[PDB]
Design a protein around this ligand. Structure first.
Ligand SMILES: *[C@@H]1O[C@H](CO)[C@@H](O)[C@H](O)[C@H]1NC(C)=O
Ligand SMILES: *[C@@H]1O[C@H](CO)[C@@H](O)[C@H](O)[C@H]1NC(C)=O
Ligand SMILES: [Mg+2]
Ligand SMILES: [Mg+2]
Lengths: 269, 269
């Protein structure tokens, strides 16, 4: 029974996430208005929102995304793009873990996702801190769909505790590491993670539990269909690390369900 | 206005049109159930609907689509697919008109669309007539999106007046010929043409009028945006050969608006 207010924020960061794929320019000047093709982010376009910094193929893991200033919603938004070819990304996904003791003790995380974040963290923390110091009453939100949602979760876990709260809104994010990391992500203070999933989306089911992966609690499960508008009654809050009955159900998953989080996402008309 | 009953046919033939692209099965042997990926054609899935015949790269013009038997709605549906690559197809669209005296006197048609149809006409007329002879109380409906909307319109014009009505439902169809042809399609007896357009979709604006092309009347104009659900009152019936104030407006057109007719069409999640 999610609040009307939190539902409206789920929609907004779904569109910031979507905007990471469908942004008008990929070399866009800082200060230029955020717009999308194909009506992928109308709520963002309604806002007084601008690009503070745009990154494409950035650092080791070819990280793509933007830092946005929203003067209407009073947000600093760091949005990470998922893969440009999601089916190929899924098939090629490695299940290798790595120590991430610098984020939390005994925590391990997907090699790729944690590597990629580490390679751009210094730059993006600096950009985020300039924004905080220029706009101290502005709320920091990190967001991402798919791979982008993994990056956003890792970055949030990493940069929390340094003076600014960081909310994270992840959309069809894969598992990011082991049970220790899931437990950290579940109780870490200095912001809330809203880990959002849809029906039988394949990506939150990877990498598999059998390779040493766990999901953080809680889960915000969208049970309304692919290409169906989402009502507030359509979101189910599921508590427990590796809880089942949401997206973690013993049935055949689906790629199309990955591309529909409140609206079209991870692809551009 | 349009009745709720007509709004439901528009939504059903939009999904029969969508299925020409997202047809879950290309194996697709006669008698197999119609299903789509990505929730593209749920109303078709609900119906007892089967492939009577399926064609790919058919004839000179490489016509693709299927002939369906629907025992729930009692339909014989010929569904033509538009292009695999609509943006490429829009850019390479040649405006050459061909004499089509054979279908109506003084009529000229798009050389491509009319040549394409003529090359599969004998084979496909025999398949509909076979289907009509076994199910004479069934309604014959030709439908398609984009290039598919044009093929259906030409097929309709050509095969009508042979003992069965042919209703045509086109989605974002281009202009198919000159004013003589547009007039023939406005008054032809032996079924109705439902020519449906969306906001500022580019495709119903091609080929241009200044290449001697005209639209048949009427036009059913969807005013609701891209990725927005369509309500009955969002559809405006616009009367008049080459009427303006629907899709035929002197503003900047849009490709994404081509891919949203009631839902996702001409593309498959
Ligand atoms: C950018 O957005 C601002 C605030 O939303 C608006 O007032 C201005 O007209 C926009 N600039 C451009 C280039 O459209
Ligand atoms: C096809 O649909 C029919 C009628 O709705 C049904 O009897 C049958 O179970 C379906 N076939 C398959 C392969 O699902
Ligand atoms: Mg704006
Ligand atoms: Mg016409």
């Amino acid at each position: 029974e999610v609040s009307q207010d939190l539902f409206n924020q789920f929609n907004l960061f779904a569109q910031y996430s979507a905007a990471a794929y469908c942004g008008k320019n990929n070399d866009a000047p800082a200060g230029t208005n955020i717009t999308c093709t194909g009506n992928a982010c109308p709520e963002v376009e309604k806002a007084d929102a601008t690009f503070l910094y745009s990154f494409e193929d950035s650092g080791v893991g070819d990280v793509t995304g933007f830092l946005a200033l929203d003067n209407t919603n009073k947000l600093i938004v760091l949005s990470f793009r998922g893969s440009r070819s999601i089916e190929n990304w899924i098939g090629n996904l490695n299940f290798d873990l790595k120590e991430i003791n610098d984020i939390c003790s005994g925590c391990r995380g997907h090699d790729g996702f944690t590597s990629s974040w580490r390679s751009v963290a210094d730059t993006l923390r600096q950009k985020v801190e300039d924004a905080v110091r220029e706009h101290p009453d502005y709320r920091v939100v990190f967001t991402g769909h798919s791979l982008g949602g993994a990056l956003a979760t890792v970055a949030g876990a990493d940069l929390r505790g340094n003076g600014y709260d960081i909310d994270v809104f992840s959309y069809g994010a894969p598992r990011v590491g082991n049970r220790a990391f899931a437990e950290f992500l579940t109780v870490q203070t200095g912001g809330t993670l809203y880990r959002i999933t849809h029906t039988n989306d394949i990506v939150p089911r990877l990498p598999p539990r059998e390779f040493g992966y766990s999901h953080s609690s809680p889960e915000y499960w969208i049970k309304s269909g692919t290409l169906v508008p989402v009502t507030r009654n359509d979101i189910v809050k599921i508590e427990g690390i590796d809880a089942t009955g949401g997206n973690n159900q013993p049935n055949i998953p689906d790629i199309p369900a990955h591309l529909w989080y409140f609206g079209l996402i991870g692809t551009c008309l």
